[PDB]
Amino acid sequence: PPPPPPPPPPPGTPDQPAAPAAPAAPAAPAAPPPALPGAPPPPPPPPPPPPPGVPPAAAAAAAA
Amino acid sequence: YKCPYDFFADRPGVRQCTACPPLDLGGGNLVEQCTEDLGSQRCKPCSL
Secondary structure: OOOOOOOOOOOOOOOOOOOOOOOOOOOOOOOOOOOOOOOOOOOOOOOOOOOOOOOOOOOOOOOO | OOOOOOEEOOOOOOOOOEEOOOEEOOOOOEEOEEOOOOOOOOOEEOOO
16 A cells, blocks of 8 residues: 655744824923012112201391 | 024013023933024033
């Protein structure tokens, strides 16, 4: 008699592991900048003026 | 008057705009800061 035949091949190996996704895109959003602090006080007012002088008591006599 | 292009002012009643200061992002690195619009109160790094 003749000899028997070869075997069939095996299949085709396994695909490699699907990759994970990407980042969650961006941390926290815009952080509010520092404050524009400070607003000074107003200078005090000026002083007042003085009163006027007193008159001259113009009277001596009639001398008769 | 509006502050000039590279100058800024924050306090309301002020007598002179102050030039934008170079932002320091670490040790010994100074990036020039320049405002975008004419009358402005904040300085951006003027490379971006």
